[PDB]
RNA sequence: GGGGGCUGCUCCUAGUACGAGAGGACCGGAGUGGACGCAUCACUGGUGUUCGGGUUGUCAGCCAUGGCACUGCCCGGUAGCUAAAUGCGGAGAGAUAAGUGCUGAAAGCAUCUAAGCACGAAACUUGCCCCGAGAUGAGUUCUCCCGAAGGAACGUUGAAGACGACGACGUUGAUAGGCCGGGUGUGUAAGCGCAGCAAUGCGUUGAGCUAACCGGUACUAAUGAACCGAGGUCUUGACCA
RNA sequence: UAUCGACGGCGGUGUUUGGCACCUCGAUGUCGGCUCAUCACAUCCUGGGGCUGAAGUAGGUCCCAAGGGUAUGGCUGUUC
RNA sequence: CGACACAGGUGGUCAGGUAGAGAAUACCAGGCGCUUGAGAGAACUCGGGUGAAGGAACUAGGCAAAAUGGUGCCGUAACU
């Protein structure tokens, strides 16, 4: 995942697709991986209620195409890319429910509230 | 006999009741004829041969001792016909692996890891690699930056780069001795051992097991 | 045996490799890995062709299980975390061992079909 | 590089041909004279080309006149030079080196058919 | 003689010390990440005019099976090498500056100084890895040798190699090939039966063909003979007889 | 006199500009960029310290020190 | 003809020899082999093929390359 990339949304906030812009604390030539919080600007969504289409917010990458290897030696790959929108309230999703599975290292050590709302875990 | 030495044959494995299945590196440990033993001293930190013990020389074995008591003695190698040995010289120099080697015993095996010419920063001193799209930019094994501040257009000697190698000594500790068997008097070491096949590797009672 | 397969019958001992996998065959796998609080019960997942696996250390293959976002991944059978498998749909054809497709083309008449 | 594969002294094509011919030479006349990487690979052009041409049958000689374009030395490979090698496996037609000849300095034996 | 390790996050310590509250640390001990450095691939993944298949034109009468466009084109693709792969990369010890002190005068007080002295910097030296007898204190050891010790030339192949080398073997041989077997790659054969009007659809065949690995096995392939070829220098330092 | 700091006075550097024009004037391919090698420091930090309008935290200023690290991107050919 | 046994230039007739829309590839007839050699599986340069994921982010400009691309049916906008 790099800047100007189009990924899908995982929460029911009204947004459909998202376009990456920048990554927080990542001075590298094009990049944004699973677990990294990035500044974004949704493209397709509901242009009313609360100006969705056009606004810039933050999000957390959950699924990507690139394959990641695990301690056992097996690599896993997904179809496309997805992310979850978060508000000002320190690492808190703006949506109600989440869609799609999540990683393990993203539970215990880092987020404990995201796992509680996660339906699947690989 | 601070330890013995053999030639790496290859890597196999032996499933033992106790413990669990684990790869084993076969090492040829055979007849040697140590005529003398060269002892080195640690002057500051520069190896230097104190003396050499022949078939009969109490004038050299004495200095060898004491210096050891002073803990100033360095690694010990002795003029050998095939492979090394220590207290083996005093006897006659003629000995077999059966005399020194038991199984299930822990030993420290050191050796020079395996000419490859010039290599890329990565394949070289383990440098990582361009993860992320960095790899997509087909810039796989490249630091991407020879050095900061284009001016000087110089690369800090530090700023590790590419170069020559092959043609590094490593002493892996805690290497359990599975067993001594094969067509010839060999040794079965648990796991892997530094260096390629045919390379000379030494054995030594595990300093700490 | 030879000094190449003489040191491979132990680790991952050739546990009677289930007749199938074979072509379209979709045998539901198993599991027993913890990853979390070690109390993991059984599990289930559909498969497909995309067969794979050699002599000594063979492996299932590209699972290609529809359920969920999609699929992929697979543990080599046998494995420390392995148990017996079972059957499913009876054969089909094309060329099992290397059967691409099935991916980038998975619908009704499209999947479970050559 | 890699292990010792074939040996294309010239290019790709010049390297099936050359085998055919210099294959029928060691059956039309029990004497031939090439070079070093000479008929050593032509020792192969013949046997195969013998065996599969051993016992007379339908799907045997049909392989003979396929590598060797000639009716003369494809018939004399049977009913002669077989049966003539009845109870003999291999050794069909070997040959030992010989001093290099004039012109192009290239040592050469003389195939022959024992 | 050549060289590097820099930085960040998290846990324990604290929601404690400090503070009205808000707010909010530290020393130290650990785990890990990013980045930059010698190798190795078993695992995951990328390559292939080896190979298998489909198919157009044309020739062998058709069929079968093949030649040609120096893989006809198209589809797939094994080994090695590789990478988005994997294993490894200290601590510690020593010395000054700024500075902190001791003892102590010149000024019988005082004073880190003026003599002397105790400590004190990621950097420096070392550790560690690599190169290295042309390392100009230009090495060490053993044996052989001053008319015969030893050595160069050749032949068969590489764990080798960019033309002048290196390494292994040379019948006290398995080094290479053949054969067989082992370990692998493809996918249903020839023929015939009944198939069928035919393409080719069936049955007999879950049948053949093929290999740039390994083992067994000398069966085959590693002579003969020539030749480069110095001969224990001189003076003296001690011992043996 | 934490910090800021006029008037006036005394200097160092020579990266700027001005001046002179002593030298070249019997010809050493431009600008910018790129690629690649070495050197320097008027240290932006890391390290050790002083002061504070220094409670703590976070900062401001200053000293020793360059060992390492001091490294990148979007628009514009463009150097502000 | 071009200073040369110079891959340059130079008019007419044979455009029904055999497979396709055709004077497009393959192949009789006829003609020819008059466009310097030998031995290991480097770097570099000239032509070219294939490359995962993104894909013009390169560039003065998509230059280059590629894509579409036969035939039949359906259907076909602004403008004129």
Swiss-Prot record, chain A:
Record annotation: effect of changing residue 113 to A: Reduced RsfS binding
Superkingdom to which the source organism belongs: Bacteria
Position of the signal peptide: none
SMART domains linked: Ribosomal_L14
Record key words, sorted: Ribonucleoprotein, Ribosomal protein, RNA-binding, rRNA-binding
Gene Ontology biological process terms in this record: cytoplasmic translation
GO terms for MF: large ribosomal subunit rRNA binding; structural constituent of ribosome
One GO cellular component, as annotated: cytosol
InterPro entries: Ribosomal_uL14 (IPR000218), Ribosomal_uL14_bac-type (IPR005745), Ribosomal_uL14_CS (IPR019972), Ribosomal_uL14_sf (IPR036853)
Residue ranges the record marks as coiled coil: none
SUPFAM superfamilies: Ribosomal protein L14
Family: Belongs to the universal ribosomal protein uL14 family.
Subunit annotation: Part of the 50S ribosomal subunit. Forms a cluster with proteins L3 and L19. Forms two bridges to the 30S subunit in the 70S ribosome, contacting the 16S rRNA. In pre-50S ribosomal subunits interacts with RsfS, which may inhibit association with the 30S subunit.
Known function: Binds to 23S rRNA. Forms part of two intersubunit bridges in the 70S ribosome. In the 3.5 A resolved structures L14 and L19 interact and together make contact with the 16S rRNA in bridges B5 and B8.
Protein name (record): Large ribosomal subunit protein uL14
Gene name in the database record: rplN
Swiss-Prot record, chain B:
Modified residues (N6-succinyllysine): 38
Annotated positions of the N5-methylglutamine modification: 150
PTM comment text: Methylated by PrmB.
An example Gene Ontology CC term for this record: cytosol
Record keywords: Methylation, Ribonucleoprotein, Ribosomal protein, RNA-binding, rRNA-binding
InterPro entries: Ribosomal_uL3 (IPR000597), Ribosomal_uL3_bac/org-type (IPR019927), Ribosomal_uL3_CS (IPR019926), Transl_B-barrel_sf (IPR009000)
GO BP annotations, alphabetical order: cytoplasmic translation; ribosomal large subunit assembly
Pfam families the UniProt entry points to: Ribosomal_L3
Disulphide bridges: none
One MF term in the entry's GO annotations: rRNA binding
Domain of life: Bacteria
Summary of the function given for this chain in its UniProt record: One of two assembly initiator proteins, it binds directly near the 3'-end of the 23S rRNA, where it nucleates assembly of the 50S subunit.
SUBUNIT field: Part of the 50S ribosomal subunit. Forms a cluster with proteins L14 and L19. In pull-down experiments interacts with CedA.
PANTHER family: 50S RIBOSOMAL PROTEIN L3, LARGE RIBOSOMAL SUBUNIT PROTEIN UL3C
Family indicated by similarity: Belongs to the universal ribosomal protein uL3 family.
NCBIfam families given in the database record: L3_bact (TIGR03625)
The protein's name in its UniProt record: Large ribosomal subunit protein uL3
Species: Escherichia coli (strain K12)
From Swiss-Prot, chain C:
Domain of life: Bacteria
UniProt-listed Pfam families: Ribosomal_L19 (PF01245)
Lineage: Bacteria, Pseudomonadati, Pseudomonadota, Gammaproteobacteria, Enterobacterales
Induction: Part of the rpsP-rimM-trmD-rplS operon.
One GO biological process term: ribosomal large subunit assembly
Protein name, per record: Large ribosomal subunit protein bL19
Assembly description: Part of the 50S ribosomal subunit. Contacts L14. Forms two bridges to the 30S subunit in the 70S ribosome, contacting the 16S rRNA. In pre-50S ribosomal subunits interacts with RsfS, which may inhibit association with the 30S subunit.
GO MF entries: large ribosomal subunit rRNA binding; structural constituent of ribosome
Key words, A-Z: Ribonucleoprotein, Ribosomal protein, RNA-binding, rRNA-binding
Record-level GO cellular component terms: cytoplasm; cytosol; cytosolic large ribosomal subunit
Lipid biosynthesis is among the record's keywords: no
Family: Belongs to the bacterial ribosomal protein bL19 family.
Function comment: This protein is located at the 30S-50S ribosomal subunit interface and may play a role in the structure and function of the aminoacyl-tRNA binding site.
Curated annotation (Swiss-Prot), chain D:
GO cellular component, one term: cytosolic large ribosomal subunit
GO biological process, one term: ribosomal large subunit assembly
Keyword Ribonucleoprotein: yes
Keyword tags: Ribonucleoprotein, Ribosomal protein
Gene Ontology MF: a single term: structural constituent of ribosome
SUPFAM superfamilies named among the record's database cross-references: Prokaryotic ribosomal protein L17
Pfam families found in the cross-reference section: Ribosomal_L17
Coiled-coil segments on the chain, per record: none
Keyword Ribosomal protein: yes
Family recorded in the similarity comment: Belongs to the bacterial ribosomal protein bL17 family.
HAMAP family: Ribosomal_bL17 (MF_01368)
Cross-referenced PANTHER family: LARGE RIBOSOMAL SUBUNIT PROTEIN BL17M, RIBOSOMAL PROTEIN L17
Subunit structure, as described in the record: Part of the 50S ribosomal subunit. Contacts protein L32.
Task of the protein: Requires L15 for assembly into the 50S subunit.
Protein name: Large ribosomal subunit protein bL17
């Amino acid at each position: 995942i790099q800047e100007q990339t189009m990924l899908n949304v995982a929460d029911n906030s009204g947004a459909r697709r998202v376009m990456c812009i920048k990554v927080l604390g990542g001075s590298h030539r094009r990049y944004a991986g699973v677990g990294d919080i990035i500044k974004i600007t949704i493209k397709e969504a509901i242009p009313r209620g609360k100006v969705k289409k056009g606004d810039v917010l933050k999000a957390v990458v959950v699924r990507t195409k690139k394959g990641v290897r695990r301690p056992d030696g097996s690599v896993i790959r997904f179809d496309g890319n997805a992310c979850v929108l978060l508000n000002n309230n320190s690492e808190q999703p703006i949506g109600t429910r989440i869609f799609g599975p999540v990683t393990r290292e993203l539970r215990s050590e880092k987020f404990m509230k995201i796992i509680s709302l996660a339906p699947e875990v690989l | 006999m601070i330890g013995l030495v053999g030639k790496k044959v290859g890597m196999t494995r032996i499933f033992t009741e106790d413990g669990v299945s684990i790869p084993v590196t076969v090492i040829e440990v055979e007849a040697n004829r140590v005529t003398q033993v060269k002892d080195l001293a640690n002057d500051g930190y520069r190896a230097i041969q104190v003396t050499t013990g022949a078939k009969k020389a109490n004038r050299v074995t004495k200095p060898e001792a004491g210096h050891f008591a002073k803990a100033g003695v360095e690694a010990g190698r002795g003029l050998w016909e095939f492979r090394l040995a220590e207290g083996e010289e005093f006897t006659v120099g003629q000995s077999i692996s059966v005399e020194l080697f038991a199984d299930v015993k822990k030993v420290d095996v050191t050796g020079t890891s395996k000419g490859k010419g010039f290599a890329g920063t990565v394949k070289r001193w383990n440098f990582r690699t361009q993860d992320a799209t960095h790899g997509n930019s087909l810039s796989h094994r490249v630091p991407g930056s020879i050095g900061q501040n284009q001016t000087p257009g110089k690369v800090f000697k530090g700023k590790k780069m590419a170069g020559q190698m092959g043609n590094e000594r490593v002493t892996v500790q805690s290497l359990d001795v599975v067993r001594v068997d094969a067509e010839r008097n060999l040794l079965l070491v648990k796991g892997a051992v530094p260096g390629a096949t045919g390379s000379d590797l030494i054995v030594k009672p595990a300093v700490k097991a | 045996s030879n000094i190449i397969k003489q040191l491979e019958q132990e680790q991952m001992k050739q546990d009677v490799p289930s007749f199938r996998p074979g072509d379209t065959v979709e045998v539901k796998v198993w599991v027993v890995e913890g990853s979390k609080k070690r109390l993991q019960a059984f599990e289930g997942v559909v498969i497909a062709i995309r067969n794979r696996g050699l002599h000594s250390a063979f492996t299932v293959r590209k699972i290609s299980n529809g359920e969920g976002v999609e699929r992929v991944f697979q543990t080599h059978s046998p494995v420390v975390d392995s148990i017996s498998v079972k059957r499913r749909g009876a054969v089909r054809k094309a060329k099992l061992y290397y059967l691409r497709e099935r991916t980038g083309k998975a619908a009704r008449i499209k999947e479970r079909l050559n | 590089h890699r292990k010792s594969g074939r040996q294309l002294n010239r290019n790709s094509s010049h390297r099936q041909a050359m085998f055919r011919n210099m294959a029928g030479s060691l059956v039309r006349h029990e004497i031939i004279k090439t070079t070093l990487p000479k008929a050593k690979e032509l020792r192969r052009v013949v046997e195969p080309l013998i065996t599969l041409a051993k016992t007379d049958s339908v799907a045997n000689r049909r392989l003979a006149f396929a590598r060797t374009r000639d009716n003369e030395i494809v018939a004399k490979l049977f009913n002669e030079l077989g049966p003539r090698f009845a109870s003999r496996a291999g050794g069909y037609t070997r040959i030992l080196k010989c001093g290099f000849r004039a012109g192009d300095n290239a040592p050469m034996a003389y195939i022959e058919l024992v």
